[PDB]
Each structure stands twice: as C-alpha cells, then as structure tokens.
Amino acid sequence: NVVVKYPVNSELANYAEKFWKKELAIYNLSLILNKMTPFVKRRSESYKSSLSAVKEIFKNVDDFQNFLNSVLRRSLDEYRVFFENYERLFNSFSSKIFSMRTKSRLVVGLGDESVYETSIRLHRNYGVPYIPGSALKGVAKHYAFSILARENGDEILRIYESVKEDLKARIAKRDKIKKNDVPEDYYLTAAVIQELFEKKFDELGAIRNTRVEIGDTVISVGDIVKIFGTQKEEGSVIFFDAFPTPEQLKDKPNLELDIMNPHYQPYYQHGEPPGDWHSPNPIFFLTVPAGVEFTFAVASRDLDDLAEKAEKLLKEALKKFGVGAKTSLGYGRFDA
Amino acid sequence: IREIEQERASFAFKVVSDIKDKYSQNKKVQGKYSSYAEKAPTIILNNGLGATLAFFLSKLEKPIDDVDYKSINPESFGNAENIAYAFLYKHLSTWLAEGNGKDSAFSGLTNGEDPLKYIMEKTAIDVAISTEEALSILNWIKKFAKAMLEEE
Amino acid sequence: FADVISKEFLHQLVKYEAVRHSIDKNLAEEFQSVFARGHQGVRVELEGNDEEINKYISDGANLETFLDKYEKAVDVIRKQVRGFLNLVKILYESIR
Amino acid sequence: GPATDGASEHAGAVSVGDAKILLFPVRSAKGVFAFVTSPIVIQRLKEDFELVSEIENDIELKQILSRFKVELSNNETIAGNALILNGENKVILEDIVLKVKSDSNVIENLVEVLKTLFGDNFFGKPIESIKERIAIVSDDVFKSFTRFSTEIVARVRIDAEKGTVARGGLWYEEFLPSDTLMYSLIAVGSPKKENLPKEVDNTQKIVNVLKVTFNNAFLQIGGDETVGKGFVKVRAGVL
Amino acid sequence: GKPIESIKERIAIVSDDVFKSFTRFSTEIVARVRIDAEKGTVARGGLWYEEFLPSDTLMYSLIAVGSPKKENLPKEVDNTQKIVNVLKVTFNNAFLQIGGDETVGKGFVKVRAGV
Amino acid sequence: MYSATFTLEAITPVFMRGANQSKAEIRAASIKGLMRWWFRALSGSYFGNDVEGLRRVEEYVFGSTKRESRVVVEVVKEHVEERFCPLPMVWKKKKGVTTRVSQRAIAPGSKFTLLLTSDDEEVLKLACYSLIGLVYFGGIGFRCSRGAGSLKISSLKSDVQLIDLPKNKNQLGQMVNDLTVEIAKILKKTFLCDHENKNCTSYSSFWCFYLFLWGEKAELEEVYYRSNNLENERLTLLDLFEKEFKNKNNHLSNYGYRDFVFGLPRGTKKDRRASPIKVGITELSEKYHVRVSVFKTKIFKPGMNVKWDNIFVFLENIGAERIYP
RNA sequence: UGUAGUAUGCGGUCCUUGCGGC
C-alpha cells in the first residue's frame, strides 16, 4: 500500500529496488543507506525519504533491523582483517589499548546532514559504527574542563578576573543585553577555562602547578595542555578511532532503531500553548545498542606517562561524561 | 575570455539579492534559506544530486517525476521552511538548466530540461559534471547568503 | 577573486570575507570601511592609452559616477583591487 | 641532505617521488568494497617502470608490464569475480551499473606486477586474496570516483559556555579513503658528502638501509595526527 | 610510451588569449612549509608558494650543430652528419631532470630525438 | 554537580515502548519528556497564562536548542522483567470471547533507578520536584491516563532538600499545596519572574486541578484488571472501576462514557486532545487506592468546548473523596 | 641552485513522551 521511488539514475533504480526487496544481496551498508535512498509514499501524497517512512516497506521494525544487521554481517571477514591490521597499527606504536562495553545506547554523528535528517557514523568501506578520534579527544578535553571547573572554579576565576570580565562582556554583547547579570555559575567557569586552554595557554603557566584527581591518578594542568596541545605547541597523545570487536557482530546485532516522539513540538518551536492537541511527529534514527564492545587505543609521542594519563582521563570521560549524541539523556555511556 | 566564475558570482548575487529583497521582513525565511544553502553541499556529496533535489521536492510536498522547476512558485508556500526549500530548489535547478542566461557565457549544462528528469535518464559522467557545477554554484550561493542574509 | 570580482558585489563579498576572518565584528566593519576607501585610489595601467581614469583618481571626485559612465569599469576596478592588495602585502611584509 | 641551517655543503643522496595513486577503494554492492584502477594509472605505472629500467640499465624489468594494452568505454569495466553480480554480467561501483568487459590478461598481469613489487603479502593479507576484487574502469569514471568518493568529515568545536557548537565552529575536511594504495619512486645516487663511513660508502649501502628501515612500517601523513588520521602502512620494494 | 592514436581524440586548439590565460593560470601552484620538531608546528616565515609546470606537457627544442672544431677529431665523427647522428642516438628515449627540486621528484622528463 | 537518585517500583505494568513497538522497555527520553510536561503543569499555577515566562524557565532548566540541558537524566540499574499484560480499557473483538487485549509490558515491581545530575541546586530541585509530582500524580508509557503507569518511590537519595513522602490521605492532600508554594518560591527567588496572575491556564496545570481518591485494597494482585469478561463476578479494583465507568447510569452525560469531556478520539474519530481525566494507583501505608486527577482547563481544545462539571457527577456516582482541595 | 611536511589548536553537538482513545 506504499509506493517506492528512487531518485537515482535509470538502470540502477531496478537494482536498488531489488536490494530493498531482499531479492538480491547487498554487502555495503553505507552504499544501500546513502547512495540508494528510497522515497516512500504512503496514503499521504508525499514521498517522504525519512527512516520513519523508509521502514514502512518492511513488515515491522524488527524486520528492518534484521535486514540492516544482515547487511552489516555480510562483510564480517573483511572487517575482521581490517581490525587485525588496526590492532597491528596499535601495537606498532607504544599505544595503550582498553576495551569497553556500551552501558547504554550510543549514537555518534546524529547531527550530520543527510536525506534521512538523522545520520550515523558508519565506516565507508565496511559500514560498521565507529567513534572518530576527534570525538574522543574532544570529550576528554571537555571532561578535563568540567573537572577543573568543579574543583578549581573560584581559584581560576580569581586568578583570571580579567579573562572572566572579558568573557562576561562578550556574553553581554551577544546574549541579548545582559549588561552585568552574567551569573558566575559553573558554566562561566567552564567557558573561561576553555578560553584559557584554547587562546590563552601561555597565561596558564602559573596554573600549571595545579593538580586534579582523576580516578586513582592525579593530573596536572601542564600535563593536560601537553597532552592536548595549543595553537603553538602540538599535542603529545595520539587519539585513535574506536571500532567494535568483530567477534560480537556474529551473534548480537550491532545496529538498532530508536524513536523520538516530539509532542508539543509547535510549543517548542512556534510558541503555541502546550495543551494536548499536539499530535506527535515520530522520527526514527539508527543507534548501536547497549552492550556492544568497542576497542580504544591512545598512543604517545613524547612520554608514555602522558599516554597513561590520557587513557585514564578518557576512561573516566566515557564512564561519566559520555560520547556521541544526546549525552544529556545517558546515551553513549561505557562500563568496565 | 569569459570565465564561468563571473557568471557563477553574478547569478549567486542576483538570486541572494532577490530573496533578500522579496523577504526583507521575514528574517526567519532568510535564516532558513542560509542554513539550507550551507547544508546542501553536504547532502549532495552524501546522497547525490538527484537525491538532494528529490529531498527538496519532498520537503515541498510535491510529487516527483511530474514536477519541473519552471512550474513552482517559491512564494506560494505558507511555511518558512517550505519557502526556503522552494527558493533553494528553484535557484539550483535554474542554474543547472539555464545558467545565467541564454546570452550569457554559461547557459546551463542541461539545455532546458528539468535537472531531476535529466538526471533520471542520463549517463554517470553527465550527472557527475552536473554535480560539480551544482557544488560550485552552491558554494557561491552560500558565500553570498552568509554575506548579506541574516543568520537564524 | 581579483580576476573575477565585479563592482556590484565587491562590497558584500569583502564584507563576507572580513566577517569570516575577523574575531570581532567591529574589526570586520573597520576593515570593510578602510578597504572600500583605500581601493578607490589606485593608478591603473589599461591596455588602451587612456589617462583620464588616472586623472580622475588623482583629484578625488565623483569617480564612481565616472566609472559608471565608463565602458571599462570592470577591468579598472579589478586592477584597482589587485594593486591595493599588492600594496597591502608589500607594506605588511615591510612591517614584519 | 643537510638541515635548513646550511645547504651549500652538499646535496641529498636521495630523491623521493610523488605518491601517485594506484588502487582506489570504491564501495560495491557485492564484494563489499573494491580496488579500482584506470588506464592512465597503469600507463603511468609503465612509464615509472621504464624510468626505473633506464636508471638501473635493466631492460629485463622494462617489459614486465609492457604486455597490457586496454581500452574501455565509459560504461564498461574489467572486474574480479567477487564484484560481479550473480546472475547478471554487471557490477555496481558505489553509484554506477557497469557492464563487465571480458578480459583476463590485464588483471592477471596487474596482480603479478603488484606481487613482484610488494611480495606475496599485500599489507596484512595475501595478494592472491584480493585478485577478485580489482576493477579497471573508464578514465572519466575513475576521475569521478577520485573526486567525489573521497571521505568528507564534518568537525565542530563545542564551547563549554552552552554545550553547543560555537559560532562558526564547524568545518569540513577532505580525506583519502581508508584502504587506498599510493606508489612512489625513491631514487638514490652517490652521496654528495665527503669522507663517508664505509658502511654507507656506495649507493647500494643506502638502498639496503632504506629498505630495511622502511619495510612494513607505519607513518603519519598530512594533518590531524593527534586525532588518529593519516596513518599509513609503508612497504619498500626493489626490482 | 603511449599510442599516438589515443592522443588524437584528446587534442584541442583554442584562441590565442585563451591559450595565454591557460598557460598562465593552469600551472600547479603548490604551497610548501617547514616544520620544526621542537614544537611540531610550521616555522615562522616558512610558508611559500612555488609554481610548477604541469606533467604530460610536450615541449620541443632546437639544437644547432655546426662544423666540429678542428682539433684532430676522429674520422668517426669528422663530419657534421656523424655528430648529429651520434647525438640523436645517444639522447633518444632518454630520461633527464631539469630545473630545481630534483630531490622531491620534480623535473624528470623523457627526450625523444626527432628521427 | 549535585546529583539525586530515585529508586522506583512499578505498581502496575508499564507500557513503555521504543522504536520496536512489540517490545516494551524503559526509556530515559520518554521519562525526560514526561518530567518536562509535569514541570509545565506545576509551573502553570505560578505562571498562569503567561506562556512566555514558562517557556523561558523551562528552556533554562531542561535546555533548549541554544543551550545544553542544565539537568541530565539517566537510567542506571534495571532490575525489571517483561511479560504480557492486558490493556487498561481495550477489549478484543474476538467472536464469543470478547476478552481483553494483552500487550508486552514491564512486569509489576520491576525495580529500577533514575539519576538526575546538575551543577546548580535550584534547577536540580526543580527537576526532582517535577519527577516526584509525576510519580505521585501521573503515569508513564502507553495508556498512562487509564491506570497503567503508577509508580511509587521505593527509595530516594538526594543531596538537596526535598519534600517528604506521605503516610495518609491528608499528606498527599496538602503535598499539592506545598509543592506549588515551593515551586513558586524558587521561581520568585531565582529568576525573579512574576507574570502576575491573570486567570486559569489554557494548558493542563495546577491553577485548576483536582485530585480524588477511591477504593481500598490490601493485595497488589487484586488491583489491576484480571477478568476477561466484564460481567464476571470476580472483578479487581481497576476492573470494578472500569465496569462502573462503562455504566450508563453512572454519569449524566448524554452519550454516557462515550462523551467528549474525556479524550478526543471518541466517536469523532479525529483530534488528539488527551483526556484530562488521569487514573492511577496510589500506595499509602501498604493500602492501595485509585487516584483520579482532573485538569479543568479553560479551553478544552481550540475549536471545541465541553462542559466540565458533568465529570464531577461521575465523582458523585462512585463517591470518590476529594483529596484536593 | 642547494636545504624545507599546509602543519598545530576544534566533540556533528543542542532541542524533542511511541504516543492519543475503545
């Protein structure tokens, strides 16, 4: 009762429809997802090319998830050799490697622009979910920022009154008028700490003697800035991408669906009173389920002690801060 | 010695000035158009040009395979998102199918056919060149939109 | 952009570039104003043996209207902006 | 060669070459991803082999690839059995349906050339295990693959004041896709220094040192080193 | 090293101004920098742009040979015909590096003497 | 970084589903949205019809599209079980049987915890108050407004001072008043918002809200619907409530239980105005009662007005005691 | 002519009840 169309060129739409009808066997998940996106028309006169409308061509959500995971599993041998080479690359450097399972659902790259409006970070060649190293480095840096703000908030605020005044003036300039309201909350401390770590690293020389307790170890501010680097000095810790272990993909699914059902969406966007006359607009998106095991590795360029400190910081961040998208809802959390 | 860069810049300036003048009051329309313009190249590189055009048409609540750019009015939509999507689709398809004009240096890769219907039954090389031209014109349009149009 | 810029969208393009490359909007506005003023006065070496343009540039006049009446306005403005950028680069390298 | 602080003393004894692409990773419907090549690529490889033969005065290796002439239409390819669709003499390379042109000598010779250049181990996997995942496509098609199938990575900067992307904190970067092959020539002559040690006296003493020190190693190319980008396995070979 | 027939399909002739603009603006402008290992960033004042003539460019040169100098030359190359013949034989299908940047694989060209 | 933990027990089976409709499981996002709704409901008493101030304070607390949420909510430990359970007020159309419809749902009890973490005391207190109001006067998941989402706080652990649990009916009676006054005090002290006081809210809020209690049971297994036939003599507390609700003679509505003062999808086969009547199960001193919450908003739905006092007649039909006010 | 790594610093984030009624 649904009409499927394909905006790809002719002589290829037939093969795309064969792939989506399971008549043929596709092997690359990113290929079928992106380059062969179907446009589904329901009783409503509109070819909505969204996962909510894309799933309508299957029997149910379970069938869609099973099809996606079978397509993912069809490249298991290639992913296995790729992971073996990746582990060899890890061991080539003096990299410390640790494995972590997903405590809750994880979704990285949800904000990427795509036809589905809700994308997911999939490896181009093999079509498996992965965490880019940039995300890990950023989450570690932000966890360090949060720890510093929570512990040494008033101290750094007093030491850098000029910087906090500059930040308050900037906020007043952009955030409405707010001439001097500018509450000195934890968020302002985090902002000025980030500003110090990004544009005012040299002025952070005095603070470098400070130490903050992470997990069981103690990390200095100088250690953190050496690990991450500045505009004038390169970081010393190499953060590699994280990939799931190939073994677990054989038995449990590595990709599932999740739903967002925004009732009162006009209230949030347009300003209508919430009430209850606000029929929802469900939107589905892919996410790797909880329990999937990922392998992380951090290497060093100058000192292995910095690598160990960065590994501890990243473990703490993944345990508490969380990586990926919708981290405010407990998504993308890892457990030992 | 008439570089296509001049035609690209002139067309982008004309279209962005047109949307700025026609909807100077609608700041949200300007913001939506700017966001769609600066996000379109990512969609084109990800899912292809035909998929991007079909996505715009779907956001316009219009059927595919039976709609061309000449038969759509961007101002005939109530919603700001629909307004911006229609304007972007019209501008991109107009550049692809006619260029800056018949007498200009660039007359569009497609003679006068609808770019989506052109993509449907053409070779991969033709759609690749069309994608490259669309990327360039979208880059210029995003530049000019960031220049003049207000930010959402 | 020196080989492609035209008179109509010079100001908006340079405004975009300033906003993109300025940390502060005031810096971008100041750069736009100073560039718009400075690039007006630059002697050009046209292919044709014409010195009226340079005479108009030297005095300080309705030179914009003269270029609007002129038939080689695009080449003149392109040469003017390229020469002003060359002067800016030379002066900056002199400073450093 | 000598460091930047002093260059008139002597010249470098080595001369690297541009890393010309040899195989490109392109997604496929069957054979999850494929290694793609173009007639200009193999022609440039033959020219490089000719230059090597001229340098070494060894004509025997000159005609190794000289038995491979190809010509393909824009909708034809010579692909391995893995990529070929079952029950249909067609292949799909990430956006295109290409009819499978029938030819075996060219792909066999290319596989043999790769085996001779890089041994029997093709960077962690046997070379014979990928002989069925190689496709030779038209020149325009290969150019389109190299221009549009490259990785496009979007990155943002998250400001701690709000937890959202900062003002203009987002940017896109172009990356060569993973599992790609780039070949380069490293020519060596007599060292230009004076009073050299006996262990590096002649050119061959540099050849063997470079080969042993840069075989199956790992290097970082380009930017984004700190975030695990640009890491490449390097293998050194000789004829 | 390539069949001349395939070249015929990809030969274009343009106007004089178009050719001049092509030869002026279609060359390879490559930006290079120098990185210091002490900090891992680009050295101050170490960024510069170099222009390179594109690969696969056909060029032609004229070599003018006269009467060899009378210095008891051997009869093998006594005449001008012999010396031009030996030059063509010894330089045909040769490979040689021109210009700077030889250490980074730039300048290698192939010479085919006209017979 | 003040944090609070709430260990909750599912008194009645909970129909919370994710993308896969056939599978029922507890979602943090749904809980967060429901706390958003309940915070709006409680704050409507102070903010009245001034929707702008309520929107601004909600965006300040729970976050918006220009700021990350100031409170993060996670589900840590899930000692829960999933089984089959009949739908609250849905009957299968099978020939002869005409029994209920049983969907997959979280089993009763199903101990699990919710952790709310923030960096400021006031916003965490607001989130905790919203969550406790949700748990005490509201359900979660599918068919929450028909007695299928009642939760009791098995345990609480907060570093910020909060409101104690009740022991009797009167305690739950004036908890509405003390929660509202504390929310108003926080709003006035922190954000200085006033919004005056115009009239009753257009949305569901505490400006016009009533809470009633009915029945009494000592066994949890004798509360939720058990009988597959309405005419059977063996009816549990919720089964008896449903039987009384379906009786035409109960209330004075012209269409009976098929009126329009309840949820929109009744006869018209259109609209999605949720039922202001919300049914739940309240535990007090190991005694189970049926709690009824009504939000008599000024406008039932834009384009439709329904009489309100008629529903109170149903409260007179069963003689439910008005806990509040 | 020789010597010379477009490199370092940056989280695709923020916002949303799988519901409404029998």
TrEMBL record, chain A:
Which InterPro entries does the entry link to?
CRISPR-assoc_prot_TM1791 (IPR010172), RAMP_III_fam (IPR005537)
Q: What is this protein called?
A: CRISPR type III-associated protein domain-containing protein
Superkingdom of the source? Archaea
Gene Ontology terms describing biological process: defense response to virus
Give the originating organism: Archaeoglobus fulgidus (strain ATCC 49558 / DSM 4304 / JCM 9628 / NBRC 100126 / VC-16)
Residue ranges of the TM segments: none
Question: What keywords sit in the KW lines?
Answer: Antiviral defense
| Stretches assigned to the CRISPR type III-associated protein domain | 101-334
Q: Does the keyword Lyase apply?
A: no
TrEMBL record, chain C:
Coiled coil ranges (UniProt) are: none
**UniProt name for this protein:** GGDEF domain-containing protein
Recorded source organism is Archaeoglobus fulgidus (strain ATCC 49558 / DSM 4304 / JCM 9628 / NBRC 100126 / VC-16)
Shown residues in whole-protein numbering: 905 to 1000 of 1004
Automatic annotation (TrEMBL), chain E:
Included range, full protein:
233 to 347 of 355
**Domain of life here?**
Archaea
* Parts of the chain that traverse the membrane: none
The protein in question is named: CRISPR type III-associated protein domain-containing protein
TrEMBL record, chain F:
GO terms, biological process: defense response to virus
UniProt keyword ATP-binding present? no
Q: Which UniProt keywords apply?
A: Antiviral defense
| CRISPR type III-associated protein domain segment(s) | 7-152
The record, for Pfam families, names:
Cmr1_C, RAMPs
All copies of domain Cmr1 C-terminal, residue ranges: 206-325
What is the protein named?
Answer: Type III-B CRISPR module RAMP protein Cmr1
Upper classification of the organism:
Archaea, Methanobacteriati, Methanobacteriota, Archaeoglobi, Archaeoglobales
